[PDB]
Amino acid sequence: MPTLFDPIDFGPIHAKNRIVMSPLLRGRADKEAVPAPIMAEYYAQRASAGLIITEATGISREGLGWPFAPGIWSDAQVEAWKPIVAGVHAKGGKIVCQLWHMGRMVHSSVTGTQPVSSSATTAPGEVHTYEGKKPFEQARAIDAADISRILNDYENAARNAIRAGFDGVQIHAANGYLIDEFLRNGTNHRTDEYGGVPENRIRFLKEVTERVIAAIGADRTGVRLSPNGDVWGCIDSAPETVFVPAAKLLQDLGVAWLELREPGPNGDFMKTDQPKLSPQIRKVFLRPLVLNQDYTFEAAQTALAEGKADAIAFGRKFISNPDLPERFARGIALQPDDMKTWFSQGPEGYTDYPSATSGPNN
Numbered sequence: 001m002p003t004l005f006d007p008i009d010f011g012p013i014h015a016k017n018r019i020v021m022s023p024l025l026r027g028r029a030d031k032e033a034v035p036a037p038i039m040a041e042y043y044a045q046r047a048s049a050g051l052i053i054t055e056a057t058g059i060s061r062e063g064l065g066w067p068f069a070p071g072i073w074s075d076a077q078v079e080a081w082k083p084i085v086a087g088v089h090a091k092g093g094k095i096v097c098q099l100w101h102m103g104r105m106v107h108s109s110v111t112g113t114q115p116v117s118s119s120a121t122t123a124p125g126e127v128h129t130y131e132g133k134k135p136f137e138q139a140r141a142i143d144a145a146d147i148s149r150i151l152n153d154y155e156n157a158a159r160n161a162i163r164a165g166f167d168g169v170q171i172h173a174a175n176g177y178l179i180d181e182f183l184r185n186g187t188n189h190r191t192d193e194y195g196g197v198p199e200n201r202i203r204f205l206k207e208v209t210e211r212v213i214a215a216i217g218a219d220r221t222g223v224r225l226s227p228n229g230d231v232w233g234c235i236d237s238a239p240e241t242v243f244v245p246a247a248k249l250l251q252d253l254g255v256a257w258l259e260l261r262e263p264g265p266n267g268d269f270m271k272t273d274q275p276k277l278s279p280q281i282r283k284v285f286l287r288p289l290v291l292n293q294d295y296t297f298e299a300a301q302t303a304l305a306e307g308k309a310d311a312i313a314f315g316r317k318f319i320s321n322p323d324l325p326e327r328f329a330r331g332i333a334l335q336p337d338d339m340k341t342w343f344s345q346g347p348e349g350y351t352d353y354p355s356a357t358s359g360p361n362n
């Protein structure tokens with residue numbers, strides 16, 4: 001029964017503590033999805049985190065519709081990630097790349113192709129483009145040839161992640177994106193082998209996970225799931241019958257660790273009514289389980305104290321607190337984060353969050 005400050009091994013990744021920086025897209029790449037030098041400074045400032053999970057990073061032009069988000073399918077993107085990773089390693093940190101395919105959460109003006117998903121659905125609301133928000137387009141239900149191509153993309157992205165120096169990768173199977181669209185029955189209306197019974201709805205996750213495992217090794221393969229929230233219109237009516245078996249599959253496949261994002265009943269951006277499945281998932285996935293969402297320092301210590309989690313990932317607190325593990329250890333109050341600069345451009349609200357009384361007061 002450890003504390004947040006006790007080390008943990010995520011496969012071969014020796015993490016000096018159990019404070020993980022959850023994935024957080026910041027939109028600081030260029031229009032070619034190539035990371036900008038400023039991203040090296042952002043990740044370096046937070047290298048005291050036991051493990052960094054990078055922002056969602058697109059596996060392909062097709063799967064990346066968020067403007068100014070980074071990618072990892074091309075040699076140019078690889079060459080740009082290299083000094084970003086090296087700068088975290090220079091401070092002794094560890095960092096994994098979150099491989100992204102956005103599925104239907106995409107706009108054809110960005111990707112160049114119609115949104116693709118498990119079924120031909122339209123997400124509610126508005127999608128970002130380089131020319132402002134636009135209505136979501138109806139998705140195309142991908143076929144077997146599409147799956148094979150998308151599997152190739154995942155492998156090449158996972159291989160490129162390792163080329164860039166990453167200690168591992170995290171498969172984004174959550175948040176209503178491509179894989180989550182297959183997992184949940186509210187969005188998977190397929191009548192073939194990838195829809196219907198829970199085993200069928202996990203088949204795409206299985207095949208994605210198998211390629212990544214075979215590409216970079218199972219000990220360097222983590223996954224993120226979001227079993228209970230209603231994220232971007234993506235929900236499953238009976239999550240237990242799908243997500244518990246999905247986590248059992250991840251165990252059987254040997255994935256080194258699992259992160260769960262679990263909204264509660266009372267939450268800002270994206271909450272829910274469906275209860276968390278971490279206790280049930282905990283019984284089937286025995287390797288490091290990472291829990292994430294509304295965690296305070298106090299609740300995070302409680303989860304490790306109660307054997308309910310191995311580590312805790314922090315998102316919004318790491319935006320505004322580059323030294324989050326030091327404020328936890330030293331009892332320092334935390335900096336609030338400014339939403340306006342979540343997805344803006346430049347260092348403002350990005351690399352100018354101070355760590356100590358060294359700003360305009362030293």
Ligand SMILES: Cc1cc2nc3c(=O)[nH]c(=O)nc-3n(C[C@H](O)[C@H](O)[C@H](O)COP(=O)(O)O)c2cc1C
Binds near residue numbers: 024025314315316
């Ligand atoms: C790939 C990926 C990218 C994400 N990017 C953001 C982000 O840019 N901003 C944000 O508030 N949450 C983002 N999230 C959700 C957070 O990682 C996290 O799960 C959630 O914010 C938990 O809330 P917390 O920050 O209070 O811990 C992202 C999640 C994933 C999986």
